[PDB]
Amino acid sequence: MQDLEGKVAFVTGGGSGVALGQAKVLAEEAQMKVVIADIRQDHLDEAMGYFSQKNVAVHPVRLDLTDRAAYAAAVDEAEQVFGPVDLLCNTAGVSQFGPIEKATFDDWDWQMDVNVNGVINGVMTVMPRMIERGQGGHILITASMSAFVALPTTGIYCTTKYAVRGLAESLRVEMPKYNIGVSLLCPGGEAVFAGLKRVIEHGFDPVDLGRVVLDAVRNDRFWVLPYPEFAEGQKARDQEVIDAMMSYADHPDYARRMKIREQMKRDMPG
Amino acid sequence: MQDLEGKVAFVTGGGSGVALGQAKVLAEEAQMKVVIADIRQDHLDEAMGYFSQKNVAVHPVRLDLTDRAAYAAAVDEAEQVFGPVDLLCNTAGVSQFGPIEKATFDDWDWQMDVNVNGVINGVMTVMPRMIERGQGGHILITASMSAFVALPTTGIYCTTKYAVRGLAESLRVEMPKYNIGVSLLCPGGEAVFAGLKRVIEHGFDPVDLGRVVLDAVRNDRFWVLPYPEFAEGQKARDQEVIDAMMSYADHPDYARRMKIREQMKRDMPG
């Protein structure tokens, strides 16, 4: 998405953390009109304490993103204050780690509601409006490296981030025909992976990561995983699945399916 | 998991489809004591019509797997009739396809509850009992090739199957220390992928797929994707992510993180 100046961004969890970093970069550098949605009023107040000292257009709204009615109202408010949402940043998220066998249903429901339903709610509230308007748009989903890597004690969290990864890849297929871009950001949160992530944690900066997002939005990039370190580790994870698939290359039914495909490339147009 | 004869299997959705195929193979070939759990009584009756003509130990229980209290009761019933669950097959699943922009919240909630919460409910009901018993066990999660491949109109379904894939990979990390095996089956449900899957659909048989599962359980295999055809397609999908990661190999912060790692392999033990 180009020409971001004056366009409207809606950032969940925007009162703190990664989301605040995104809000800062979009409002200051990109000069977008940014709505920051956060459940906590004090976090909103803090962010506005910062933005009140900058030449920006930022509007706070207190929102529990698990509340579908309130979400719709918050987006209505965004439209009245600034205008139709051009860029949706689904960046809000929670995490509570522990052994999976000790997890409660309340633990599951809480993280599922915020991390998955929160993203679903935003997408389903905003994306149909984008399509109706017919001026395109962009949808950012902030997942995690946990959408690729399961770890001890991150069972629930991992499940929620895989989920929104699937949603993101699904949007990626159906949104382009509406000129709506889709980006999937995986900041994070093999003991080798832990050691590599820890160094990333040490250098991590929300504003710097915000500029990575900005770059991805401008150039309409889907995969936003700015970590070359994880490459060899991911290749190994990928190869497990490939090897699993190829372990049945021997099995007769496969040769039978290949016999049919061979015959069907003959006979027919293309 | 070995020595399956006489051991107890709990199969959700066991009254029909893939799940019934699993139940048949476990009850007849493996000679397990199989509990089939299904929401529909008539499907239960049909399956029992079949099993009543075989020398098997099969017990039906009508269960809405989205009902946590009922699920616990169904597993209690399994313990009273046969004994503690040794093999849990989370195979129940629903699907309703359509353009994502037309999806309702009811569409989301329904498929999320059955496909994701249904699996969570089973795992959280049975797995702590397995651990408490201290005799190990095995957990099968039946996802889909949609846990790897997003497709037009499969947005909700894809999201739910990615989710349980994450849960499966999470279980894979934490369960081995309790001698509990984990298997992830992806039957299915690039226009090339569609064409390849259609030929698989044509040859698909629930009993044959049931024998694939049996083989995976016996040999404690996690990745159960018996389709070599999808290899080259998946490699291409994998390479997108690798290339995305490596696209920042140039960026200074990465070289900075590598400088730190280089120094830390020196200095310290290992």
Residue numbers in the entry:
A (entry chain A), B (entry chain A): 1 to 189, 215 to 295
Paper text:
A cellular pathway has been characterized that performs β-aryl ether (β-ether)3 bond cleavage using three sequential Lig enzymes. The first step in the Lig pathway is a stereospecific oxidation of the benzylic alcohol in the GGE substrate to produce β-(2-methoxyphenoxy)-γ-hydroxypropiovanillone (MPHPV), which is catalyzed by nicotinamide adenine dinucleotide (NAD+)-dependent Cα-dehydrogenases LigD, LigL, LigN, and LigO. The final step consists of a GSH-dependent lyase, LigG, that catalyzes the elimination of the GSH thioether linkage in (βR)-GS-HPV to produce glutathione disulfide (GSSG) and γ-hydroxypropiovanillone (HPV). Our structural and biochemical studies of the enzymes in the bacterial β-aryl ether cleavage pathway reveal the features important for substrate and cofactor binding and catalysis by these Lig enzymes.
The LigD and LigO enzymes catalyze the oxidation of the (αR)-substrates (αR,βR)-GGE and (αR,βS)-GGE, whereas LigL and LigN are specific for the α(S)-configured substrates (αS,βR)-GGE and (αS,βS)-GGE. We have solved the crystal structures of LigD, LigO, and LigL, which by amino acid sequence alignment belong to the short chain dehydrogenase/reductase (SDR) superfamily of enzymes. The SDR family is characterized as a large group of NAD(P)H (2′-phosphorylated NADH)-dependent enzymes displaying an α/β folding pattern containing a Rossman fold; this overall organization is seen in the LigD, LigO, and LigL crystal structures. The superposition of the LigD, LigO, and LigL structures using Cα atoms shows a root mean square deviation for LigD-LigO of 0.88 Å, for LigD-LigL of 0.70 Å, and for LigO-LigL of 0.93 Å, indicating that the enzymes display similar overall structural features. A sequence alignment of LigD, LigO, and LigL shows an identity between LigD-LigO of 40%, LigD-LigL of 38%, and LigO-LigL of 37%. In these alignments, the most sequence-divergent region is in the predicted substrate binding loop. This proposed substrate binding region is disordered in all of the crystal structures solved in the apo-form (LigD, LigO, and LigL) and in the structures of the LigD·NADH and LigO·NADH complexes.
